[PDB]
Every structure is written in structure tokens, then in C-alpha cells.
Design a protein around this ligand. Sequence first.
Ligand SMILES: Cc1cc(OP(=O)(O)OC[C@H]2O[C@@H](n3cnc4c(=O)[nH]c(N)nc43)[C@H](O)[C@@H]2O)c(C)c(=O)[nH]1
Ligand SMILES: Nc1ncnc2c1ncn2[C@@H]1O[C@H](CSCC[C@H](N)C(=O)O)[C@@H](O)[C@H]1O
Ligand SMILES: Nc1ncnc2c1ncn2[C@@H]1O[C@H](CSCC[C@H](N)C(=O)O)[C@@H](O)[C@H]1O
Lengths: 257, 260
Amino acid sequence: EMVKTIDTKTRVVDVTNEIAKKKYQAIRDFLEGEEFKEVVIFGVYLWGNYTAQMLSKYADKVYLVDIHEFMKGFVPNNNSIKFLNLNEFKLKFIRGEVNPDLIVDLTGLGGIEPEFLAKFNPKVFIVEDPKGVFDVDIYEADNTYKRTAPFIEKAKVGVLKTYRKARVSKTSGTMTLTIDTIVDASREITSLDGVLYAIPNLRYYEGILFHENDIHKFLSEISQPAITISTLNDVLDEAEEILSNNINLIYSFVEEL
Amino acid sequence: GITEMVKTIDTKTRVVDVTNEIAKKKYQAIRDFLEGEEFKEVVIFGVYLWGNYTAQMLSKYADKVYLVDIHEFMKGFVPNNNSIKFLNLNEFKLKFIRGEVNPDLIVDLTGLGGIEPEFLAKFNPKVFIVEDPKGVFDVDIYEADNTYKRTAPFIEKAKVGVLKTYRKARVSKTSGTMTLTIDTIVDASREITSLDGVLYAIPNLRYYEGILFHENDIHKFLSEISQPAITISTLNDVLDEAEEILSNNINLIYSFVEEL
Ligand SMILES: Cc1cc(OP(=O)(O)OC[C@H]2O[C@@H](n3cnc4c(=O)[nH]c(N)nc43)[C@H](O)[C@@H]2O)c(C)c(=O)[nH]1
Ligand SMILES: Nc1ncnc2c1ncn2[C@@H]1O[C@H](CSCC[C@H](N)C(=O)O)[C@@H](O)[C@H]1O
Ligand SMILES: Nc1ncnc2c1ncn2[C@@H]1O[C@H](CSCC[C@H](N)C(=O)O)[C@@H](O)[C@H]1O
């Protein structure tokens, strides 16, 4: 028949990976190759392990810390990185067994407490700003600049921001940006000659993690093609180009305080 | 969930609810056109996606209703509790050759690549209605469409209507029930996203058409399309507003039958 079905080659996980790569490039540009004795990163989901893997070439030791123990599943059996849950990390800290010179806080809304951060004395502190477009309630829920306050006087402080150029996203969260990229791409693909419709293939992946604690299933579901297209014409290349253009709109940078 | 302040909310409205609202709008356009006319024998071509609904509704006005599809597996959409007679197209052609069918109402829902004008021309209905599958202009969809070649054998002797369905101030590429369903839900999800405190809103859509036309699995189709239309991550309870937004987007859809 005249109507074809086309899945994009780009998967949801390819979009999340491209966004993590951009976020890390912003941190890399900020750090300019500074070397560290001990790095602590708070927050595994969704790009903390990628960050840890990348920073480990610049650090003697890297700790990746999460309040949820099941997040251990995202951290490879390698030893250039140590996963700790938050309670294990607190215990190490009370014992004087950790003393990081770089801290990266990726925990975002409702995340790690300023008061706890204030107990540390790093050379460099980077916090990810979870905010996106102006929103009274998300702004009120955010306390990013309270997390930076204990460090301004003595450390190099950076605030990591990620936005979509001339497009609306409500947060800088890797998943939020992924959803908005793929939904927007589906609308632009719809407009292409001969296309009847284009489905963004998205699921509530966060529930598989935070409710079901099932990393294998999370990974299986995010490997799905990003978009499925019903069309009279072969538009795969155009659709890939559209997804690429929407990814290239995402802009990540570190604000130095 | 992810953190105490953040909630996850599914809409009460399901994907199938949106498809049902669109089918109702299409049928009401047909009903308005027909003006209560009663028929001895109705033939509807094309079960997917609103042919069974049309068949059930028209059965009140008709002594016999046939619902005909080129695909035999489409029978699974016709419940066991009605008078509708399903036939595949080969069976219907044989009935015609035997002189056993002679409809006075024909409704053609087959759309692009559908039933042939030459075959339609074998009939002499009192009324002929064809669904125009087009939406906003697209050169390839427009060239593929042959709606007005299908009306041509009937203009002279019959009451002829062409059903058009579109969205106001929005682009949809076809009038297809599924197309309109997708576009409605994706658009609503973007408007819901914008509400105060919302982090993201996912349109919950799958390639249902594949479950039917290549897996031939009616049950799985119906199960999957019953999913909540939108899933929302949010600081605030926006359920009522989200339902309202989804309702506003459904109400952009308008259907009318053009009499030729
Ligand atoms: C080969 C053949 C052609 C034929 O006339 P058609 O051009 O197919 O259709 C005639 C009417 O069909 C309608 N029509 C034709 N093309 C169009 C069109 O592009 N858009 C709309 N809205 N209406 C159209 C007009 O009302 C015409 O008066 C008839 C009636 C026939 O029996 N055989
Ligand atoms: N106090 C805390 N300490 C360590 N991890 C925390 C925490 N509170 C929340 N988390 C973890 O931090 C993550 C928050 S979601 C953060 C998403 C990230 N900023 C992105 O853009 O992808 C989750 O992995 C959660 O389990
Ligand atoms: N020649 C033919 N005769 C009868 N049914 C046909 C046909 N060609 C396609 N069909 C059937 O017609 C339907 C086409 S999809 C039609 C979609 C419909 N107009 C809507 O808006 O929802 C399918 O059920 C298909 O199996």
C-alpha cells in the first residue's frame, strides 16, 4: 500500500545521551582541565554516572552519591568510581574519610540541603540549576543560590544552566529536555510533505526507577525509537535532521559566581 | 516518586475517549445530513476507526446494515450484541453477483487507497456519503485522494455528501480519526506543560495502527488505546485544568457534510 511506517534510528536514549554530553561539555569548559584529588558528585539520575566517568580522568578518586541505593545499578563495576548511598557517604564524612576538593550537585528540586553542603570546604563547587522558563512555582521551589552561599567566599563556584534557544522547557532536567525535544520534533515532522502523522514515543520512565526500582526495565524502555511516522514518503533522513536540529538548540553553560 | 514535592498525575481522559469524541462528531455530521431518512439496506465500507460506531448508530434507521472491510480480521471490532452484519469485500462482491445486496445508503469511510470508483458505480443508492480523508493541503496527500472521482457516478441520481473533518487554527495532515487523536493529545500535552508548577507532560501514544494492521490483535489494540491520554509531572494538582485543556483541544475539531 501507499502508506509507510518509519521509525527514527535515533532512540530516546540517544537524545538523553546527547543532552548529557552537552551538559558535561559545559562543565569541562568551566574546569579547563583542573586536576583534583577527590571528586564528589551528588545525584546519579540522569547524567551523574556519565559525569563521574568523564571527571575520573581529572581526579585521583571519584565518589558518586545518591540518596537511593538502587541507583548503584547505573554505575559500572569499574573502580575509577565509587558509588555510595547518602547515608554511607555521611558516615565516611563523619569519620573524616572523605574531603572532596570538587563537589558537583546534580540533585535539583528537593535535592541535597545547603546546610549539609556547608560542612564541606571544596576548591570548586558546581550546582545544576533545575530551572527552565520563568515559572512562579518552580522558581519558588528552587534553592540553587542557597546551595552556592556557603562557598562563594572561598571557592570557585559555578552554576550549570541548560535551556532551549527560543523554545519553552519548564526545567533543565535531562528528561524534561528529552521529552520536549522529541515532542517538538514530532510536530515538525508532521509538517513534512506526505506525512500523515508522527508519534513521539515517550513513556513515564521515571516511574520505572523511582517506583519500581527496575534499572534493566528502565534501560529497555528508553532504547525505543524516538518517533514513529505514518507517511506517503520516505522522510527518515528529514526526520533525523529535524531531531538533530532540535538537539542542537539545547544550550548548556556554567555561570561563574 | 522522584522527590516529595513532585507529583505524577494521569488524566482521567483516555486515548480511546478522545477517539470516541471524534467519532461522535463525525457521526453527528452524518446524522444532520441524513435528516432522519430511513433506509432498507445500508452498506458502510471501512471499519477502522469509526465504522462500527457508524453502523451501530445507523441501525436505528435501517432494516439491514452491512459493514464491509477488505480485511477479514476487522470483524473483532464488531461486538457480539448487535444486528450489524460484517462481510469481507470478497464476500460482499459475491453477494452482489448473486443479486443479494442493493443498498439505498452507501457510506464510504475507506479514505486513501480505498474502495474503487468503478466498483461503487455498480450501485444505485438513494444517498451516498464519502469521507474526505484530506486535511490541510499537502501535495502528495491531495494527489493520492480521489474522493470526487468516487462521487461522480452518483451526482446525477443520488443525494451525495462529502464529510470533511478538520481542526480550527491548527494543522492536521488528514481527517483520519487516529491522526486527529494524536494531534489533539500532543497539542494538549504542550499546553498542559505550560501551566504553573508543571515540570513536563507526556502524551501517552503508541503506534496502535500496527497492532491492528500487522499484528491483527484487536484485543491488544483496545487494551493499549485505553491508556490515560497524558501523564504529568508537577508541583501542583493540575488535573482539572488538564482535563479542561484536553476538552478545549477536542472542541477545536469540526465535522460537516458538504452536499454536492
Ligand atoms: C469522469 C466523470 C466526471 C464527473 O464530474 P466531476 O468533475 O468528477 O465532479 C463534478 C462535481 O464534483 C464537484 N467537485 C469536483 N472537483 C471538486 C474539488 O476539487 N473540490 C470540491 N469541493 N468539489 C469538487 C463539483 O461540485 C462538480 O460539479 C462526473 C459527474 C461523472 O459522472 N464522470
Ligand atoms: N539529598 C540527596 N543526595 C543525593 N542524591 C539525591 C538527593 N536527593 C535526590 N537525590 C538523587 O538526585 C537525583 C535527582 S533528579 C536530578 C536530575 C538531573 N539534575 C538531570 O538533569 O538529569 C536522583 O538520582 C535522586 O535520587
Ligand atoms: N477497498 C476497500 N473496501 C473495504 N474496506 C477497505 C478497502 N480499502 C481499505 N479498507 C478498510 O478501510 C479502512 C481504511 S482506514 C479509514 C480511516 C477512517 N476514514 C477514519 O477516519 O477513521 C480500514 O478499515 C481498511 O481495512
